[PDB]
Design a protein around this nucleic acid. Structure first.
Ligand SMILES: [K+]
Ligand SMILES: [K+]
Ligand SMILES: [K+]
Ligand SMILES: [Mg+2]
Ligand SMILES: [Mg+2]
Ligand SMILES: [Mg+2]
Ligand SMILES: [Mg+2]
Ligand SMILES: [Mg+2]
Ligand SMILES: [Mg+2]
Ligand SMILES: [Mg+2]
Ligand SMILES: [Mg+2]
Ligand SMILES: [Mg+2]
Ligand SMILES: [Mg+2]
Ligand SMILES: [Mg+2]
Ligand SMILES: [Mg+2]
Ligand SMILES: [Mg+2]
Ligand SMILES: [Mg+2]
Ligand SMILES: [Mg+2]
Ligand SMILES: [Mg+2]
Ligand SMILES: [Mg+2]
Ligand SMILES: [Mg+2]
Ligand SMILES: [Mg+2]
Ligand SMILES: [Mg+2]
Ligand SMILES: [Mg+2]
Ligand SMILES: [Mg+2]
Ligand SMILES: [Mg+2]
Ligand SMILES: [Mg+2]
Ligand SMILES: [Mg+2]
Ligand SMILES: [Mg+2]
Ligand SMILES: [Mg+2]
Ligand SMILES: [Mg+2]
Ligand SMILES: [Mg+2]
Ligand SMILES: [Mg+2]
Ligand SMILES: [Mg+2]
Ligand SMILES: [Mg+2]
Ligand code: NA
Ligand code: NA
Ligand code: NA
Ligand code: NA
Ligand SMILES: [Zn+2]
Lengths: 123, 80, 53, 53, 122, 50
RNA sequence: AGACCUGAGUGUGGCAGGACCACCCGCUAAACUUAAGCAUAUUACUCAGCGGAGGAAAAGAAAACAACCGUGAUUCUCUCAGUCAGCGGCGAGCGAAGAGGGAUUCAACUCGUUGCCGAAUCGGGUCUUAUAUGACCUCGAACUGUGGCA
RNA sequence: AACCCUUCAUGUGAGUAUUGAGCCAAAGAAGGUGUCAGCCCAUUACAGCCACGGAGCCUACGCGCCUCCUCAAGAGAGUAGCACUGUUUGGGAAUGCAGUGUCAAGCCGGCAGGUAUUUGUCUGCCAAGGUUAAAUAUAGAGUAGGAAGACCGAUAGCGAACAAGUAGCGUGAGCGAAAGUUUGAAAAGUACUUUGGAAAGAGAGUGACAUAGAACCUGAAA
RNA sequence: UGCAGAUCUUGGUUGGCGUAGCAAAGAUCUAACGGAAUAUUUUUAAAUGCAACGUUGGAUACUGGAGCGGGGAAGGAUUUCGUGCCAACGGCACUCGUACACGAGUUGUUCGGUCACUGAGCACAACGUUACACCGUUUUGUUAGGAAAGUGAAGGUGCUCUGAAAAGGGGCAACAGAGAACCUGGGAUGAUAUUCCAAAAAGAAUUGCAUGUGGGAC
RNA sequence: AACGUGUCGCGAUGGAUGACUUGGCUUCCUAUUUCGUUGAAGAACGCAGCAAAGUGCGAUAAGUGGUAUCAAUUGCAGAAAUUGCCCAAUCUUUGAACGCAAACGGCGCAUGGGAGAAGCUCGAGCCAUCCCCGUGCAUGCCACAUUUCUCAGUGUCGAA
């Protein structure tokens, strides 16, 4: 019953203690499962696992935004781990970019300036 | 004695399970698979058996990553 | 264009006390040894299949 | 996938006991079973009742 | 739009509808008094509503809605039940298009739905 | 005999766990079509080999 | 002792490898069958085999047609035409092209070479909100020629 | 209401059916609901209204500001050509190509002009380097969706309307089925009595119908 | 788009027929108990409930150590054990079962493998060939027209430089070859044991690393 | 006599026929429509309260996060979310598979962490041997050494 909104404000140390705490009842619930306790306790198993999953989601998000900020500096773009880069496709990564595909020579630039397209209409 | 009696003389086994395709077609002595040609880099694919090709082609399994990337293409890689 | 002919069937020939229709290979399926490929056989190819032209 | 050394350390952390022997086997169903003998300074029955048996 | 010229397609979409689609499909007409008060012809049925049966074996009966069994395309109404062999009473399902709504359970979301469905000028 | 690789042992373990009957509460579900397990195996009838 | 030439080791940043393969591009390449037999021929420059891409591929801007009162890159369609063109134990059989009516079409550009210049070019670093077709530096590459004009 | 007569008890499911009155239509559209439904439900529209929208594409080459930029010679060489051999073509004294040998011209040039050679005119083009949308294919491909059909209707149609490339077969390459869970509107799926070890039988009960009793519609022939 | 036959296809049914048979490996008997399987009659005891099943005791007899004895490899993979249970299956029978159902069981410093050897042999790298590697070479001391060693003897510095010598790339292939430090007892099980036993370890040992102290030397 | 034969009523055996159809086949159209070393396609093993197959998912395991809709799920539990779509994430062992191998859940080198019950220092700190985890390490080819790295040649020259 941790709820995602509550876990936003917490720091890393508090999250780890909460995560370590939650694993204990999960173990205690499992040993009770072998002692065929009533189904009321068996409902708590699903709640605990969902609570654990939410904590791990928050921890992973916080770590990722830290690394992006650290590597946001220029001249470190070659040192950024590949898992933090954009993953579109194999083909799109190797394709010509916008600043390369539309390159023109000096002669092409002058000719385009000399003979632009027109709108004329007739009669 | 080429019939029933000789059936009792068959002892070992020619093939075991393949590490790449999972079939019982890995030749123990020659160390290669009769079904997928492992450890060769390419696998077997012949046009005289279209039935065999359709048994192994894409879509007969899980497509664990292909499903995700197809969804991204349909949404033109929307992101935050 | 492939309906009813996707089997590796073959005639048993004469001398086995059966008709000379092609029969299905293999064993252990209750389909093995059954007739195939004929317009008179169950699961066979129809006579003069319809075309789109 | 665990080995004896990690099993011994984990038991000490979880239940605060000292062991003198760890024996393991892999069951026919694929699960691993461990026999853990405690020191004479610790009571196995007392630990079992604490866990709830 | 389930209905189309392809009968095979229309029937497949109806019988494979997801849960939120099924909620719209099982709707019931409002009574004359509710119609004059809300200017709404029909509403989907929800739990704790009060309905009156207009067609079938239980014609004229009234009761409160105790379940919306979307998996079976029926609703369960209290006092509409049958006796088993051993003496246990069990509910009997009724299709939502055979009843009419008498009293509505209202919350903030339901009132918003009624307002957006109202057929009035300006 | 005594010898077997651990990978082969795990394959036999999965087949053993699969050789089970259908639970009774499954048959009472809405729209159920399963009556009994059609993949039951006996060691004297069909051989897995492995 | 030091250059140039040729050749190694390591480090930093990148790429290739497999799958799919209906359609498309390059190679390799039969026989059953028909000829009432059969060897040239036919099936067929097809099936099987190997290699390689795309959303289409390939082709494409005249060392082209024609012989007229002349047309004007490529591709496709009707037709030319089962042809009083042609190939063929001249047997069985096989077999196109120009022209004409259309679909599409603001469709065309460029390197080397010749003449005038001769690092004005490329890579790396720094700055300008900028890995600028910008500026400055660079015993780095490049005169065994990168770029600019006709 | 079953050899005939008399007497006493039992038996008709659900109104989308019939009749009489109306109403809507810029909507009559074909799905659902216990029998055949424009008006029980969902649908049927813009002759529309909201949310989210990082990149990309389109719009007086959308629109401001700062920077930058701009406005006498020659023409592809182990190439083309030729000889031999092989293959290919409708290409026929040789259409294209490949191997080896030989190997150019450009102060009266070269290639083509469908019968071989030598010589002279005329006509059209200028090989041996490169890029390029549209109109075309998808003859056992994929990702999302739509339109359908004088097609098949469970031995048919894909092998597969179902836990089907599954069960099963073969050392292996490979081969490969059967099978509509179609009871009923609704499980209301037969409590209880009695015989029996049980399985079941004889009663009773639910349901309009149980000769609709559970792989249960209809239920033919041998 | 019309069926009587194609040694036609797929299902179902059928006389033969309660027939042919169920005849190698010698063989069972008796009392008590168990079981629904009895000692079952209304219309004296025999002539009206037959036949057959498991366990225990006793009898008889077989295998006859090249065994219907006790352990392993290949192959099989829960057939192992306890409890329950008889619809279908074990071509007769079952109360029995390797059947069905529900639960249990496999414990290693020293056993086998591996860490860690070579053999008949295989074929990554390198090179060459092929229109195309999915081809060839690769132990007669041994890859490759072939620069494949990344190790470090004496010596200097201090408490870390300089360099002698070493030809021939990297792997796999033996659960009967090479190699390998543990033995008995148990009242320790329903089922595992040279694997379990805890202070009088029932005990007695052997070996791999790290340490700290007592002692000999730097 | 019996067996046997025939007809009618009823009952068995069997699964045809008819009516049904969330399936197949064929043709046409529209797109911000075309995988992978940033580890694909395939293959294996696991995950639910009761869960064999199938479906979904990966130790965050019939799901975490966002958004729209607005009260269920349903066999029994159990609680007082579910469904559609999608940006943020997780993603076991393998496989082109690439540190070396492989009927082995085996064996390394470098680097950074973790646990530690002997020992040491004053109940804590430092922890030897042993053990666990993350990352890098195939081959080939291109560019660079931007503080211009280290070399080899009876190749061509060349000073003290
Ligand atoms: K054995
Ligand atoms: K209705
Ligand atoms: K030449
Ligand atoms: Mg033979
Ligand atoms: Mg032999
Ligand atoms: Mg062999
Ligand atoms: Mg071998
Ligand atoms: Mg065929
Ligand atoms: Mg067919
Ligand atoms: Mg062990
Ligand atoms: Mg085996
Ligand atoms: Mg490829
Ligand atoms: Mg592709
Ligand atoms: Mg033919
Ligand atoms: Mg002939
Ligand atoms: Mg002949
Ligand atoms: Mg081909
Ligand atoms: Mg192109
Ligand atoms: Mg021809
Ligand atoms: Mg020229
Ligand atoms: Mg081109
Ligand atoms: Mg079929
Ligand atoms: Mg019936
Ligand atoms: Mg007939
Ligand atoms: Mg007899
Ligand atoms: Mg006999
Ligand atoms: Mg004897
Ligand atoms: Mg004797
Ligand atoms: Mg028997
Ligand atoms: Mg069993
Ligand atoms: Mg050798
Ligand atoms: Mg040995
Ligand atoms: Mg040993
Ligand atoms: Mg034993
Ligand atoms: Mg590897
Ligand atoms: Na002939
Ligand atoms: Na079939
Ligand atoms: Na013996
Ligand atoms: Na070895
Ligand atoms: Zn394989």
């Amino acid at each position: 019953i941790v709820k995602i909104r509550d876990l936003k404000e917490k720091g890393k140390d508090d999250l780890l203690k909460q995560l370590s705490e939650f694993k204990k009842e999960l173990s205690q619930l499992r040993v009770s499962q072998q002692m065929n306790v009533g189904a009321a306790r068996l409902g708590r198993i699903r709640t605990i696992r969902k609570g654990i999953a939410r904590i791990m989601t928050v921890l992973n998000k916080n770590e990722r935004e830290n690394l992006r900020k650290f590597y946001s500096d220029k001249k470190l773009r070659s040192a950024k781990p590949k898992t933090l880069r954009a993953k579109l496709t194999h083909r799109r990564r190797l394709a010509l970019k916008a600043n390369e595909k539309n390159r023109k020579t000096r002669r092409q630039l002058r000719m385009a300036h000399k003979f632009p397209r027109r709108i004329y209409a007739v009669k | 004695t080429k019939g029933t009696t000789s059936m009792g003389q068959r002892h070992g086994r020619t093939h075991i399970l393949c590490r790449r395709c999972g079939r019982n077609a890995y030749h123990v002595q020659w160390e290669r698979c009769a079904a997928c040609a492992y450890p060769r880099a390419q696998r077997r694919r012949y046009n005289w058996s279209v039935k065999a090709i359709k048994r192994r082609r894409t879509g007969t399994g899980r497509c664990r990553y292909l499903k995700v990337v197809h969804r991204r293409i349909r949404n033109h890689f929307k992101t935050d | 264009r492939l309906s009813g002919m996707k089997h590796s069937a073959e005639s048993w020939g004469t001398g086995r006390a059966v008709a000379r229709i092609p029969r299905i290979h293999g064993g252990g399926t209750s389909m093995s040894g059954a007739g195939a490929f004929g317009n008179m056989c169950r699961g066979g190819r129809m006579f003069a299949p319809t075309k789109i032209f | 996938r665990a080995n004896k050394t990690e099993i011994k350390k984990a038991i000490r952390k979880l239940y605060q006991v000292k062991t003198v022997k760890v024996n393991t086997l892999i069951r026919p169903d694929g699960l691993k079973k461990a026999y853990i003998r405690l020191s004479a300074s610790y009571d196995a029955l007392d630990t079992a009742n604490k866990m709830g048996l | 739009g389930i209905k189309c010229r392809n009968r095979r397609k229309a029937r497949r979409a109806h019988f494979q509808a997801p849960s939120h689609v099924r909620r719209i499909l099982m709707s019931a007409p409002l009574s004359k008094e509710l119609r004059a008060k809300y200017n709404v012809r029909s509403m989907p049925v929800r739990k704790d509503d009060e309905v009156r049966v207009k067609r079938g074996k239980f014609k004229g009966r009234e009761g409160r809605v105790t379940a919306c069994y979307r998996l079976k395309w029926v609703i369960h109404i209290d006092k509409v039940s049958c006796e088993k062999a051993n003496g246990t009473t069990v509910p009997v399902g009724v299709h939502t298009s055979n009843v009419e709504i008498t009293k509505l359970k209202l919350n903030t979301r339901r009132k918003a739905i009624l307002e957006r469905k109202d057929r009035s000028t300006k | 005999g005594r010898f077997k690789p651990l990978a082969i042992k795990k394959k036999y373990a999965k087949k053993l766990k699969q050789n089970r009957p259908v639970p009774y509460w499954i048959r009472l579900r809405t729209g159920n079509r399963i009556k009994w397990n059609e993949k039951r195996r006996h060691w004297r009838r069909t051989k897995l080999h492995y």
